C-alpha cells in the first residue's frame, strides 16, 4: 500500500523529467524542420504559379502518407511489392507474440483484427514459455562453462552461488558483444544506418518497445541476402531473452536501492 | 459535408447530344478526383468517366470511349460530361462523385472509391 | 533441453499457421487496392506543366527529410501538431517504459536517440516494480471483495482448489468489464472507431504490442475533453497489470492442456 | 507442476517458539527463490521473509525482524522459518512460495513475484 | 562533383556597374538554391544575395539592397548578379555557391549552408 505509492511517485517524476528532457532535445529541431520546409513550400508556390497552395499541400501530404506506409514516393513506379506475402506475414506474426509490434505491417481487414486479438491473447503467453526455456538453456550452457573452469582450477564448490555470480558477469559481458555490438555493426553495413541509428534499433527492438521507425529488412531499395532474414529472426529470438535477463537484473538493483532508501529514511 | 449538385439531362432521340454539369460546394474542389457514374434501372452504378485533380488526364469506360468527354473548371467548382452520339443503352441516372483520397484518377473506377455523391440526373435516350 | 526444443517446434508451427491465416485474410484485400502515389505524381505533372519532374521530386524529397521520425495513426497525418510539447512528450516517455511504443512520436535527433536508449534501460525495470505493486493492489482489493463469497463457499465444504479456480475466473470477468469492455465503449463514442477497432485498440495496447495504427487522443479533428487524456493514462497504467495477470492465467491453462 | 507442502505449525502461548518447514517436489529447488507469507483472518497476505537460491541473502519484514529467521537446506528441498518470541499478532495461516524466474534475491517481497504456492499452515499464538 | 565557374568582374570607378555570371555543370541546376558571397581582404565570406530554385524569390544583405539584383536562367544553368551604383566598400572576390539541401533560400545566408563553390571572381571599385 505504501510501497506501491512510493514507486508511483518515482515513476511520475521519471516521466515528467523524461518529458522535459525529450522536449528540450527534440522540439527546437522539430520547430526548425517545420519552418524549413514551410519556407521551401512558400518559395515553390511563387516559382510555380500554375500550382495553388491547396493543390501542392495535397500532393505533399499524400507523399508523406505513402512513405509512412512503406511505398517510396521517389522514382517512377515503386510497384509497392507485398506486405502480406507468406514471408512477411510470418514476420508480422512474430512482432505480435514477441510484443515488439513495429506497426509497419498491420491488419486492415475485419477478419485480420479479430484474428489478431485472439492471436495475441494465446500467442504472447506461448512465446513467454519459449523465452523462459531459452533463458534456462543460456543459463545451463553458461553454468556448464563455469563448472568446467572450476574443475580445472581445483576450487571446491560449497554452493552454486559462486557459479551463479561468475555466470551472470560473463553473460552480460559476452552477451553484449553477441546480441548488441556485433548486430549493430551488421545493420550499419546492410541497412546503411548510422552507428547511433543501428544501436538505437537494437535497444528499441530487444526491449520490446518497437516504435517501427527502424525495421531491419524493410527497405525496398536494398537487395537483402538469403541469410539476412533468418539471421535477424534468430537474433530477435535469443536477443529478447538476453535483454529480458539484463533488465531483470536492473530491476533487482532498483529493488535493492529501495531497501537502502527505506533504511536511510527510517 | 461537401455537396454535389448535378444539372443538365433530360430526354433526347438516338444520335443526339447532352451536356451534364456538377457544381460542388466549399473551397477544395481542385483537390478532388471527379468522376461520373450511371445507374441503369435494376443495375448497379457503372463507371462512366474519371478526371485528374487538374483536368488534363481523362479516363473512360470502353462503352462510352470516343463518344463521351469529361472536363472540369476549378474556377467554377464544376465537372462536365459531354455525351455525343447517344444510344438507347445510355439511358440511366447519372451520378457525380468526388474523391478526397491518396492515389490518382486512373484507378478510381469503382463507386466505393469516392467519398461524396450527388443527387443524380435522369438521362433518357429513345 | 528437450522441453525447450518441444516448445520451439510449437512456436514455429504457431507462427507458420498464423502467417498462413494472416496472408489469406489480408493479401487478397491488399491486392485489390490500386491507389498509388506514383500515378497521383504522374497526373500532377500533366496538370501542372509549369513544374518539371525533378523540381517536384526535390520538394517531395525535402518534405520527407523534414518529416517527423514517428508514423502517425491511420488517417491522422495532416494534423501538423507539435509532437514534442510537454504534454505529448510526457505521453511519449510512457510509451517507452511501458514497452507499448506506438511509434506515432519518435526521436529524430541524435541526443533524443542516446537519451531514449538509457531511458528504456533504466525506465522499463522501474515501471515493472510499479506494475508488480499494482497487480498486488488489484489482488488484495479483489480478495477483500470476494471474501464474502469465499466464506459462503467454505461453509458448503467446497475444496480450496475449486475456490481458487472460481475466484480467478471472476477476476477476469469483472476485470474485463472495468479494463476492456467499458473503455472500448468510451473509445467508440469519443474516437468514432468501430466496435471492433475499439476492442482491437484495447488488446494491442494492454498486451504492450502497440502497433501505432490506433492511438487514443491522436485525432486533430476531435476536440478532446480535459478529463480524457488523464483517464486514458490511468486506464493504461492499471489495465496493463490486469492483462499481465490474465496472460499469466492463459499460460497456466496451456500448461494444464499439455498434461491432458 | 512444482508442489510445495508446509508442516510444523500449531498452537503456542505468547513468548514461545515454532519452526515451520516447506518441502518441495522435483530436482530444481536450489534454483528457486523461497519465501514466506502470512494471511491473518480478514487481512491480505503479507510478506514475512525471503531467501536467495543458496541461502546467504535473507530479507525480513519490519514486524518480524529480529524474531524470525529464514533458512534453507537444498539437500532436503526444504525452506524453514524459525519463529522466536511469538506474539498474539503473529496468529495467521503461513504460506510457502517458490520463484523460478530470474532474480528475486532479497527483493521478491510481493505475492505476484512468486510462481508456486503451498496449501498453508495454521499458526496460533494465545495471550 | 558539381562545378561552378564565375565570369564577369573586374575594376570599375565608383558609381559604375558590373554583371557577374556563374555557370554550373550537370542537369540539376534547377534544384539548387543559388547564392552570392564576397570575401574582402583578410575577412570571411559575407553574404550578398540568395535566390529560390525557380528565381522568383530574392533576398539581399542590407548593404547591397536596392543596388544589386540577383537573377537566374535554369535553361542555361546560370545565376547572375547585377551590381549597380557600386561603392568602394563593395570591393571583394565574389563567390558563387549552390545548395542541394532541404530548405528555402530565405534562410541560406551563411557560407556553411552551401555545398558547392566557385573559384571566385575579383571585383574592385575605386574612388
Ligand atoms: K511494443
Ligand atoms: K510497438
Ligand atoms: K512491448
Ligand atoms: K509502433
Ligand atoms: K507506428
Author numbering:
A (entry chain B): 74 to 339
B (entry chain E): 1 to 126
C (entry chain A): 74 to 333
D (entry chain D), E (entry chain C): 1 to 127
Reproduce passages from the article.
The first activatory nanobody (CA10767) hereafter referred to as Nb-Activator-67 (or Nb67), binds to the side of the Cap domain with all three CDR loops interacting with the external face of the Cap helices. However, these interactions are not symmetrical and on one side the EH1 Cap helix is partially unwound at the midpoint (residues 107–109). The structure also reveals a nanobody bound to the intracellular side where it occludes the entrance to the inner cavity. However, upon closer examination of the crystal structure this ‘intracellular’ interaction appears to result from tetramerisation of the nanobody within the unit cell that may drive the crystal packing and the resulting non-canonical structure. No activation of TRAAK or TALK-2 K2P channels was observed, but for the related TREK-1 up to 50% inhibition of channel activity was seen at concentrations of Nb67 > 1 µM. However, Nb-Activator-67 does not appear to contact these loops and instead only interacts with the extracellular face of the Cap domain resulting in an unwinding of the EH1 Cap helix on one side. Intriguingly, both M4 helices in this TREK-2 structure are in the Up conformation consistent with a more activated state of the channel, although this could also be due to its interactions with the nanobody bound to its intracellular surface. Full occupancy of ion binding sites within the filter of TREK channels is also usually associated with an activated state of the channel, and in this structure all the sites appear occupied, albeit in an asymmetric fashion due to unwinding of the Cap on one side. Although it is tempting to associate the effect of unwinding of EH1 with the activatory effects of Nb-Activator-67, the crystal packing interactions make interpretation of this particular structure challenging.
